[PDB]
Motif scaffolding. Structure first.
Motif, short mmCIF file in Angstrom:
data_model
loop_
_atom_site.label_atom_id
_atom_site.label_comp_id
_atom_site.label_asym_id
_atom_site.label_seq_id
_atom_site.Cartn_x
_atom_site.Cartn_y
_atom_site.Cartn_z
N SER A 56 0.81 -1.22 0.00
CA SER A 56 0.00 0.00 0.00
C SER A 56 0.84 1.27 0.00
O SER A 56 0.38 2.31 -0.46
CB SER A 56 -0.95 0.00 1.20
OG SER A 56 -0.23 -0.12 2.41
N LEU A 59 5.18 2.52 -4.79
CA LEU A 59 5.03 3.60 -5.77
C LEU A 59 3.62 3.66 -6.34
O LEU A 59 3.08 4.76 -6.56
CB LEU A 59 6.05 3.42 -6.90
CG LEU A 59 7.44 3.99 -6.65
CD1 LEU A 59 8.40 3.57 -7.75
CD2 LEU A 59 7.38 5.50 -6.54
N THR A 60 3.00 2.51 -6.59
CA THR A 60 1.64 2.46 -7.13
C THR A 60 0.63 3.01 -6.13
O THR A 60 -0.21 3.85 -6.48
CB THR A 60 1.29 1.03 -7.52
OG1 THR A 60 2.30 0.50 -8.39
CG2 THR A 60 -0.06 0.97 -8.22
N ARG A 62 1.26 4.98 -3.57
CA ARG A 62 1.52 6.39 -3.34
C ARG A 62 1.04 7.25 -4.50
O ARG A 62 0.61 8.39 -4.28
CB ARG A 62 3.01 6.61 -3.09
CG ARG A 62 3.38 6.80 -1.64
CD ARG A 62 4.86 7.02 -1.47
NE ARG A 62 5.59 5.76 -1.56
CZ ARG A 62 6.72 5.59 -2.23
NH1 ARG A 62 7.29 6.59 -2.88
NH2 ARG A 62 7.29 4.39 -2.25
N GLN A 64 -1.61 6.48 -6.32
CA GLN A 64 -3.07 6.47 -6.21
C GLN A 64 -3.60 7.37 -5.10
O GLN A 64 -4.82 7.58 -5.04
CB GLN A 64 -3.57 5.05 -6.02
CG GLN A 64 -3.37 4.16 -7.23
CD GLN A 64 -3.76 2.72 -6.98
OE1 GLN A 64 -3.85 2.29 -5.83
NE2 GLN A 64 -3.98 1.98 -8.05
N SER A 65 -2.75 7.91 -4.23
CA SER A 65 -3.17 8.84 -3.18
C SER A 65 -2.98 10.30 -3.58
O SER A 65 -3.24 11.19 -2.76
CB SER A 65 -2.41 8.55 -1.89
OG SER A 65 -1.03 8.83 -2.02
N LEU A 66 -2.55 10.57 -4.80
CA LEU A 66 -2.21 11.93 -5.21
C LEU A 66 -3.46 12.72 -5.61
O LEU A 66 -4.46 12.15 -6.05
CB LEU A 66 -1.23 11.91 -6.38
CG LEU A 66 0.23 11.50 -6.11
CD1 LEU A 66 1.12 11.90 -7.28
CD2 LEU A 66 0.74 12.09 -4.81
N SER A 67 -3.37 14.03 -5.45
CA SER A 67 -4.41 14.95 -5.91
C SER A 67 -4.24 15.23 -7.40
O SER A 67 -3.32 14.73 -8.05
CB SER A 67 -4.38 16.24 -5.09
OG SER A 67 -4.87 16.03 -3.78
N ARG C 190 -2.02 6.30 3.03
CA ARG C 190 -2.55 7.65 3.12
C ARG C 190 -4.06 7.65 2.91
O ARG C 190 -4.60 6.90 2.10
CB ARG C 190 -1.87 8.56 2.10
CG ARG C 190 -0.37 8.64 2.25
CD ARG C 190 0.24 9.58 1.24
NE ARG C 190 -0.02 10.98 1.56
CZ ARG C 190 -0.29 11.92 0.67
NH1 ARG C 190 -0.35 11.64 -0.63
NH2 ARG C 190 -0.51 13.16 1.08
N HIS C 241 -8.14 21.06 -1.29
CA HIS C 241 -7.60 19.70 -1.32
C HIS C 241 -6.61 19.53 -2.46
O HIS C 241 -5.65 18.76 -2.34
CB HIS C 241 -8.73 18.68 -1.44
CG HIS C 241 -8.25 17.27 -1.53
ND1 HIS C 241 -8.14 16.60 -2.73
CD2 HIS C 241 -7.84 16.40 -0.58
CE1 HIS C 241 -7.69 15.38 -2.51
NE2 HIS C 241 -7.50 15.23 -1.21
N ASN C 246 -3.58 15.20 0.50
CA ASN C 246 -4.28 14.50 1.58
C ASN C 246 -3.61 14.72 2.93
O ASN C 246 -3.53 13.81 3.75
CB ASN C 246 -4.41 13.02 1.26
CG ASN C 246 -5.35 12.76 0.09
OD1 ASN C 246 -6.57 12.75 0.25
ND2 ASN C 246 -4.79 12.55 -1.09
#
Ligand SMILES: Nc1ncnc2c1ncn2[C@@H]1O[C@H](COP(=O)(O)OP(=O)(O)OP(=O)(O)O)[C@@H](O)[C@H]1O
Ligand SMILES: Nc1ncnc2c1ncn2[C@@H]1O[C@H](COP(=O)(O)OP(=O)(O)OP(=O)(O)O)[C@@H](O)[C@H]1O
Ligand SMILES: [Mg+2]
Ligand SMILES: [Mg+2]
Lengths: 106, 485, 437
Positions: A56, A59-60, A62, A64-67, C190, C241, C246
């Motif tokens: 989790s 790199l993948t 991280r 997928q958590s980007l704005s 996250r 945001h 986040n």
DNA sequence: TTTGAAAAGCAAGCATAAAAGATCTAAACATAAAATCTGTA
């Protein structure tokens, strides 16, 4: 069976019994009764959840958590680095690429 | 008073600071140090490692053989012995100060010959053909600090405990100013001389310059690795002071190693033992069992070791390992635990000699997982195409991805691609690294197969093979999958 | 025999903590890692787990305060024995000094000496050491964590006190350095936007309701107060945001900065409809608002930027304005306009004499008046001051010799400051870069 | 008003200075236990 499939996956990737033990221990511990433990060892779905959590923060996960702006700046910096020969960039060139991209989108 | 740091673990020895030059009024006031109680040496820990035994331990036939071949328990060193004994005897008899340089490879009997020369000199001094002398032995690798030699030798001479600088000036004053009729001859063995080499060479110059003093009566036997150690690591002053007549300890020939091993096994080879068949305990003179170790096995072990090193330790250890292998097979077949002819054969010797010759690198890489083998295979492909001997890790990532996506009709690759890229699971995304990527990277770095550059960028960090390329290919050629593609 | 608490978006992590942490040392790992980036609820989940199970004996240490490895060892030695005194006050003990520990084997010896005096206890227990932020140590090397993995092996197996380590990590690469040790690791991914919105609402609405500003804008002009607070938190999240990502802490800071100005526009008409209040306080949701020389020095800085971002061959075309007696041809300038935009790159290095020549070329102005500017002692004093202010840099940073001819010079300020500086004295520095890109 | 022609600009390539930093050491700064020197007594 699912347990033999997970043992085979460990044999091809890790070949480590401590690696398998670190996933089998919270399968046993999180079960509340005997039938839940039997269903958990028959299904091995907790092993899939464990394997998902172990990747989790890669790199993948991280990415997928980007704005949207973070992803846009990252794509712009990757474009500047791919065009550069040393793979180097700074804030100014990445912002120029981002600004050109936003004008070409709008 | 508030302290900026604390040293709360200081352990300071009770060693005095006043040297020998300031404890008497003049040179003519120094008394006869031979007729002094503390001078010239005129064990409390041995009780602490004893316990009571309540089991009769079973010593088999090979136990006496293996105890016999220990290095702790001189047919081939008779000219080196004669040279060292003649030089030391002439220096003791004439009250002269001298240096005897001895060098050689490990295990060729340098320390043993020097100690036998010293014991024979002490035997000669016991029956009064030479004046009495003190023997001091200083090993350079048994010193915590190199200056401890200064603290050691003076403590063997005067019985005092001083600091190293004060000990050095005390030794200098004793060797230079004290008259020869007032002192005693001292023979000092400097073992592992390369460990006493410092950056400024103070100790080396002092020890070989005291031998040039008239009143010193000091004999220094310096034992070293090589002939050209002064010509490589020492200045021309120390090389001049050591001298030109340097004693070589060449490696043993196979006849000499064979004679050493036969002189060890002189009383127990081709012998008879009383062996109780229920337990296996053997008693030298219930079955009478005849023990032999064949001379052909000892001979070829002597030939191999003499060709490799000439090391007596290596020959004794090869014979002891063969005896251990024979004893292991014997206790396995006879059901003997721990509480008519027994022969240490030539096959046991050849099993002992090949055990340090078989390479576990190919065996280790053969039994690795598929992903570690795929890493090694992709690295070999990159070394084949671009020929760099150092490949970037991102290049290995893209080459692994390319090798997966090109051989996408291979049945094993079709069965395992979801394992490498999703861990066999839906709800796990397509990953950028394979599963167990850093695991096999750290595994190959732990084994010493790879070298990794210290960089924090994972893609342009380079990785180099630490082993030879053909054994890596050989290990890749054993596998059925990586052979096909 | 473990109570499992309820963390709103950390259920798997809480179940893993219940699986790995227990009062039995027989079924507890020696080392446990909680890996996650900043603001992922690692500390929150670990506090809720240990608060739900008070029988677990935990010692909390922060390596970010300890900075180096030696105060970390001393802190372990101090806090373990302080917790053991406050845990079993009827046990006679010898107070070992934590300053005795300068090396790791001294820590092993001190821990052994502390633990051998608690053998009168009946059951074996665990002492949990939480190193919250191990890789936040400012003096970190790769060999330090290896000394902590193998620390239990140098401690006695048959002890009544059995120390267990719980590590907290931030970076993935630091954790992946130690992958072959097979330490059990729980990972904290996250939060997404709905999760951080819910966490922000249930962690901040209670004190946004009870702020004195919101209770003074009503009286001098509880479900509806919670509606206003939650609507403000959702508006802050929706506006920023994209700016914060986040991050819980950045959105908390923006909520803190923009709450009183949002309260100061709530009237009796804006309290019951959210759209008119959003239109009234619109300016808080378009901009982040998270922010705080002599003539000789200013022209020396401008000349430094010119020397760092122009080529020396083109100087004879721009600044030359003198009548010629001896026949000679001036430089033609650059033949074609290049597209590099040199202000995006690092500045180039120049000499002192080129700096002074361009400085007197660009400085503001019968037979004894001497129109041009001399390089007297105050120009050099201002240049030395500019080097003191770190607005001019050299190749050397320490033991600098200013008088060496092999020492070169560069500007240390970007374009956004020299624009203000040049417009403060009305110099057209943007004309000088119009001939390129 | 042209006019050719020398001053100047651009580009590729190679030798070489120079920046950046990895590695290490001497010296200043700091503490500290045992030995040694005063100093009366
Ligand atoms: N001539 C010999 N006769 C019998 N045994 C010998 C002889 N030479 C060596 N050995 C055996 O080999 C052992 C090692 O010898 P020794 O310690 O003298 O080696 P060395 O030449 O000083 O080597 P190193 O450089 O490693 O110190 C001895 O303890 C002894 O058992
Ligand atoms: N699941 C949650 N439920 C409620 N509040 C939460 C939750 N997660 C985080 N918070 C709030 O956000 C704060 C930040 O979380 P926390 O301190 O645990 O983060 P972290 O991952 O340990 O951070 P860091 O690495 O910066 O120390 C908490 O103190 C708490 O107020
Ligand atoms: Mg030796
Ligand atoms: Mg925290």
């Amino acid at each position: 069976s699912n347990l033999n499939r997970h043992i085979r996956m460990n044999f091809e990737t890790f070949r480590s019994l401590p690696t398998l033990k670190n996933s089998i221990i919270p399968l046993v511990a999180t079960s509340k009764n005997f039938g839940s433990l039997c269903t958990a060892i028959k299904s091995c779905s907790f092993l899939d959840i464990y394997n998902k959590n172990q990747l989790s923060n890669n790199l993948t996960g991280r990415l997928q958590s980007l704005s949207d702006l973070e992803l846009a700046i990252l794509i712009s910096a990757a474009r500047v680095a791919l065009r550069a020969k040393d793979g180097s960039f700074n804030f100014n060139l990445a912002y120029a690429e981002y600004e050109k991209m936003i004008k070409a989108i709008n | 008073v508030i302290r900026k740091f604390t040293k709360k673990n200081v352990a300071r020895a009770k060693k005095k600071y006043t040297p020998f030059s300031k404890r008497f009024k003049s040179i003519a006031a120094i008394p006869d140090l031979t007729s002094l109680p503390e001078f010239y040496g005129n064990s409390r820990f041995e009780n602490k490692l004893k316990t009571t035994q309540k089991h009769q331990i079973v010593e088999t036939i090979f136990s006496k053989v293996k105890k016999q071949l220990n290095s702790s328990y001189l047919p081939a060193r008779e000219n080196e012995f004669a040279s060292i004994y003649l030089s030391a005897y002439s220096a003791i008899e004439s009250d002269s100060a001298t240096t005897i340089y001895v060098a050689g490879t490990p295990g060729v009997g340098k320390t043993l010959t020097v100690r036998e020369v010293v014991k024979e000199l002490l035997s000669s001094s016991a029956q009064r053909e030479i004046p009495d002398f003190l023997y001091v032995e200083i090993n350079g690798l048994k010193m915590v600090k190199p200056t401890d030699c200064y603290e050691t030798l003076w403590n063997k001479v005067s019985g005092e405990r001083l600091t190293w600088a004060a000990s050095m000036e005390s030794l200098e004053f004793y060797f230079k100013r004290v008259p020869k009729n007032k002192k005693k001859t001292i023979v000092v063995l400097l073992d592992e001389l390369d460990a006493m080499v410092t950056k400024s060479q103070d100790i080396m110059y002092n020890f070989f310059n005291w031998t040039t003093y008239e009143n010193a009566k000091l004999i220094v036997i310096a034992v070293a690795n090589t002939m050209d150690l002064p010509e490589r690591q020492l200045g021309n002053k120390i090389t001049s002071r050591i001298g030109f007549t340097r004693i070589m300890f060449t490696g043993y020939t196979h006849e000499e190693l064979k004679n050493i091993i036969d002189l060890r096994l002189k009383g127990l080879n081709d012998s008879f033992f009383y062996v109780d068949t229920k337990t296996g305990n053997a008693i030298l003179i219930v079955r009478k069992v005849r023990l032999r170790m064949s001379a052909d096995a000892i001979e070829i072990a002597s030939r191999k070791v003499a060709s490799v090193s000439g090391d007596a330790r290596r020959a004794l250890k090869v014979c002891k390992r063969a005896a251990e292998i024979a004893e292991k097979h014997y206790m396995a077949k006879h059901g003997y635990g721990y509480d008519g002819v027994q022969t240490v054969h030539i096959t046991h010797v050849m099993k002992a000699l090949n055990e340090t010759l078989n390479s576990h690198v190919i065996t280790f890489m053969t039994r690795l997982s598929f992903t570690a083998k795929l890493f090694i295979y992709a690295l070999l492909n990159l070394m084949k195409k671009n020929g760099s001997q150092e490949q970037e890790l991102g290049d290995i990532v893209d080459e692994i991805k390319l090798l997966i996506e090109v051989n996408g009709s291979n049945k094993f690759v079709m069965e395992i691609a979801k394992t490498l890229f999703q861990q066999g699971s839906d709800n796990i995304s397509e990953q950028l690294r394979i599963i167990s990527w850093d695991f096999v990277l750290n595994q190959l770095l732990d084994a010493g197969i790879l070298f990794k550059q210290t960089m924090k960028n994972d893609r342009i960090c380079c990785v180099k093979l630490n082993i030879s390329v053909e054994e890596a290919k050989r290990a890749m050629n054993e596998d059925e999958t990586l052979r096909n593609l | 025999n473990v109570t499992t608490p309820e963390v709103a978006f950390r259920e798997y992590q809480t179940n893993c903590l219940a699986s790995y942490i227990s009062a039995d040392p027989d079924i507890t790992p020696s080392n446990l890692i909680l890996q996650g980036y900043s603001g992922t609820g690692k500390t929150y989940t670990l506090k809720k787990y240990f608060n739900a199970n008070p029988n677990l004996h935990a010692v909390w240490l922060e390596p970010v305060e300890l900075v180096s490895w030696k105060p970390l060892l001393q802190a372990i030695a101090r806090t373990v024995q302080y917790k053991l005194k406050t845990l079993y006050p009827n046990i006679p003990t010898t107070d070992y000094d934590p300053l005795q520990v300068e090396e790791p084997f001294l820590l092993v010896k001190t821990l052994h000496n502390i633990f051998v005096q608690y053998e009168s206890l009946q059951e074996k227990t665990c002492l949990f050491l939480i190193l919250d932020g191990f890789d936040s140590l400012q003096d970190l090397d790769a060999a330090l964590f290896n000394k902590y993995i193998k620390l239990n092996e140098l401690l006695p197996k048959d002890s009544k006190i059995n120390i267990k380590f719980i590590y907290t990590m931030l970076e993935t690469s630091f954790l992946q350095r130690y992958s072959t040790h097979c330490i059990p690791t729980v990972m904290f991914p996250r939060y997404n936007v709905d999760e951080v919105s819910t966490i922000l609402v249930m962690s901040r609405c209670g004190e946004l309701m009870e702020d004195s500003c919101l209770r003074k804008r009503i009286i001098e002009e509880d479900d509806q107060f919670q509606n206003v607070a939650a609507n403000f938190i959702h508006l802050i999240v929706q506006a920023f945001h994209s700016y914060t990502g986040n991050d819980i802490f950045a959105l908390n800071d923006l909520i803190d900065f923009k709450w009183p100005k949002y309260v100061s526009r709530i009237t009796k008409e804006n309290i019951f409809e959210p759209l008119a209040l959003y239109k009234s306080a619109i300016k808080l949701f378009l901009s982040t608002d998270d922010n705080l020389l002599s003539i000789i020095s200013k022209y020396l800085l401008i000349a430094s930027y010119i020397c760092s971002y122009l080529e020396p061959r083109y100087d004879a075309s721009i600044f030359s304005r003198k009548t010629r007696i001896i026949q000679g041809r001036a430089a033609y300038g650059r033949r074609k306009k290049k597209e590099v935009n040199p202000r995006y790159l690092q500045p180039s290095l120049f000499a002192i004499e080129r700096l002074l020549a361009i400085f007197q070329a660009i400085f503001p102005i019968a037979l004894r008046e001497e129109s041009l500017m001399k390089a007297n002692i105050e120009v050099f004093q201002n240049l030395s001051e500019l080097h003191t202010l770190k607005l001019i840099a050299t190749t050397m940073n320490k033991n600098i010799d200013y008088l060496s001819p092999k020492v070169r010079w560069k500007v240390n300020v970007p374009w956004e400051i020299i624009k203000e500086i040049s417009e403060s004295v009305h110099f057209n520095i943007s004309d000088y870069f119009s001939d390129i890109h």
